[PDB]
């Protein structure tokens with residue numbers, strides 16, 4: 141079959157053939173859609189062959205060598221390893237290709253126009269937390285690049301029995317701590333209070349401040365995780381100020397310039413890389429709307445609207461909306477002023493529509509999660525809002541996994 | 552057999568069992584989701600094996616709503632509907648069943664953020680209508696009733712059901728009250744670009760265009776598959792709010808105004824296998840409907856540019872968020888205007904809050920509530936409204952409102 145999707149702002153129509161190559165569940169059934177559910181629901185020898193063959197098949201097809209001598213030998217070599225070792229090892233080329241295509245296949249990611257420019261750091265030779273610490277430090281120094289950020293991933297040893305997992309317990313490489321006070325209130329980032337407790341428990345001496353960079357809590361080979369403090373010179377940070385409101389700096393906000401997911405799982409050929417931190421650069425609304433203005437986060441909306449002499453009696457005065465825009469002007473202006481790479485939601489979506497059209501043209505489609513692609517503010521005035529999108533799961537993929545503190549058995 | 556949905560702002564989990572009674576497909580599969588497609592999934596004059604089981608379902612459903620979970624009346628009604636399909640080739644709905652069906656189509660409207668009011672719906676049985684003149688009469692009564700001098704009331708008028716496909720009753724307007732869109736000689740568009748085609752059909756039918764920016768379109772009404780007829784709504788029946796801004800005194804000098812009564816008049820109301828092609832239903836606006844979409848959409852009124860000019864915004868680049876900032880002010884102006892004129896309007900904060908309460912209510916008493924997150928989340932400030940963080944299950948329950956073809960694609964002109 142073919143499938144059509146339509147832009148209702150422009151009437152452009154694209155024809156998705158690539159969905160015929162989708163695999164694991166969307167979660168949706170023939171009669172129920174779950175597109176708004178965030179989390180819907182080790183491989184044995186038999187289970188691993190078809191996966192390995194499919195990915196090797198797709199890699200050799202991507203390099204115009206399908207059915208070739210080097211293709212058929214690779215397959216046989218992988219088949220050998222899974223009999224010998226119940227698993228197999230990716231070549232370097234397959235690891236780079238796998239990582240890039242897992243980003244390419246990230247339905248929820250609006251930045252995928254950059255997918256082919258990923259720096260892949262092979263860390264599969266790593267054995268200890270300290271070594272992970274060295275890889276991530278280098279990852280951050282590279283990615284940050286004095287403000288001119290560069291996409292990168294670092295991939296650590298794949299799963300084995302599941303009893304020897306590598307994990308970055310941090311959900312992002314750079315995050316700020318949260319501290320719950322005895323009086324209910326929260327100092328710092330409420331999102332990270334639980335993780336802040338875990339670190340404190342593991343010996344972290346916290347500065348109990350408002351923007352404390354958290355420590356890396358790194359697990360290697362299934363051992364208890366260990367604490368490392370990122371060197372402060374490596375953590376690029378941007379004080380937030382406003383181009384019109386001089387009082388804005390008096391909020392004393394800042395944010396880190398380098399966004400980096402670390403809690404996720406990278407599947408390639410049926411091999412699971414449970415520690416694969418990846419970084420890019422920020423869309424302004426991630427900080428400006430969600431990090432600062434979510435009620436379960438830094439929640440400076442009332443603060444910012446208070447200083448904007450806004451009527452906060454009636455919601456219909458739209459103070460929340462007014463204050464949300466200004467905060468997002470400031471976020472953008474601040475990164476741009478300090479020449480730290482950032483992208484506004486308009487430019488990012490405009491670029492995602494181009495990328496999506498190009499991906500239908502050369503690839504047969506582009507899986508896309510409209511619920512995640514549409515920015516969290518000003519939705520309808522961005523072009524993705526009027527763009528129909530099909531959601532399927534292509535592999536290689538990034539996958540969610542359980543939090544390590546829910547699984548790990550301490551020793 | 553039992554699915555849960557979770558709110559991420561408040562950690563509240565609801566357990567959905569109502570989806571087990573979902574009837575037809577959503578367009579999705581285990582393999583590919585279409586939750587962002589607008590339309591996923593005349594001889595359809597059923598046989599008896601095709602129409603009776605649908606009818607039997609709705610009557611079974613109605614009689615179980617009313618505690619007569621099987622009874623004398625329910626059994627007679629089945630046999631009455633049975634013989635009716637045998638002879639009249641279809642069947643007619645009792646007045647109660649019709650009111651139940653209309654209220655429940657709205658209840659099951661997965662895209663409708665306003666459904667907490669679903670049971671306070673005025674139903675106007677117009678199944679005795681035979682002509683477009685009569686349709687015009689019934690609609691003028693709807694508009695006046697529902698407008699209620701600014702204290703808007705929900706209502707639906709239900710014209711006779713489809714029979715053979717070639718005797719359809721249709722309202723050709725998409726909403727009862729829409730502004731005209733005119734194709735300018737150079738290439739621009741005056742008025743509302745969404746309606747350029749409908750405006751030309753009306754002009755091609757002899758409507759004399761005043762050619763302003765907010766000309767109210769005439770009703771194009773179709774009865775019994777016959778050609779459609781133009782009627783001008785009486786202007787004293789079309790309430791309009793001039794748009795001014797509580798702070799920007801230069802705002803009213805934009806020459807902007809909108810209508811007060813939103814009325815969808817192009818959907819199909821399906822009950823027990825019966826299809827009501829003409830069923831205009833009205834409520835009141837969420838401000839974002841007018842001021843985000845009607846006013847700011849690129850292929851609509853596109854006034855962001857002009858508002859931003861007067862606000863003195865850095866329009867050099869997007870990262871200034873000059874669009875966003877003007878978007879806020881406009882919606883402020885729209886709410887401020889409807890409320891200053893005591894015309895019913897609901898902001899997007901209040902509306903989404905209410906629908907969270909509605910959802911909880913439906914999971915209490917019914918075991919679920921089908922919702923379309925893509926449509927429920929307002930088109931501005933989405934994440935700062937409670938629904939953005941509210942997981943939703945979507946499924947199709949009957950009775951329901953369905954889309955249908957624009958009648959001019961499919962109409963044999965007498």
Ligand code: HEM
Pocket residue numbers: 239242243246248249250251252254258291292293418419420421422423426483488512538
């Ligand atoms: C290069 C610039 C990038 C931009 C502008 C960007 C933008 C975004 C945004 C705004 C989200 C939504 C996340 C949220 O709302 O919390 C997202 C999600 C995501 N992105 Fe990107 N991203 C970029 C790079 C990357 C890279 C380099 C990768 C992997 C190699 C990646 C993979 C993902 C994944 C897996 C998600 C899903 C997040 C989740 O489900 O938790 N992205 N991206």
Ligand code: HEM
Pocket residue numbers: 657660662663664665666668672705706707815832833834835836837840844897902926952
């Ligand atoms: C009473 C106040 C109401 C409010 C505030 C409200 C709100 C909304 C909104 C914001 C939408 C999305 C519209 C858009 O952006 O295009 C919608 C859609 C819808 N509503 Fe409501 N609504 C109300 C009344 C009603 C009534 C009375 C009915 C039925 C009698 C109804 C049935 C529907 C349906 C079927 C849709 C889907 C429209 C479509 O699919 O194109 N609503 N509603």
Ligand SMILES: C[C@H](O)[C@H](O)[C@H]1CNc2nc(N)[nH]c(=O)c2N1
Pocket residue numbers: 148525526527528529587588589925926927
């Ligand atoms: C492609 C996408 O489904 C389409 O633009 C939808 C998105 N969400 C919407 N939500 C509402 N309320 N109204 C709409 O018209 C739309 N359009």
Ligand SMILES: C[C@H](O)[C@H](O)[C@H]1CNc2nc(N)[nH]c(=O)c2N1
Pocket residue numbers: 176177178511512513516559939940941942943
């Ligand atoms: C319930 C809903 O799925 C949840 O709030 C989602 C919606 N869309 C999102 N979109 C983005 N970009 N980020 C998010 O966290 C979410 N959260």
Ligand SMILES: Cc1cc(N)nc(CCCN(C)C)c1
Pocket residue numbers: 312399400401418419420421422423426
């Ligand atoms: C690589 C990358 C870039 C970016 N801008 N954002 C992300 C996701 C941020 C974390 N959220 C899932 C909480 C990842």
Ligand SMILES: Cc1cc(N)nc(CCCN(C)C)c1
Pocket residue numbers: 665813814815832833834835836837840
């Ligand atoms: C009855 C009703 C009430 C309301 N508040 N909004 C609507 C939306 C109408 C336009 N869209 C479907 C194009 C309908």
Ligand SMILES: [Zn+2]
Pocket residue numbers: 168172173174175579580583584585586
């Ligand atoms: Zn779906």
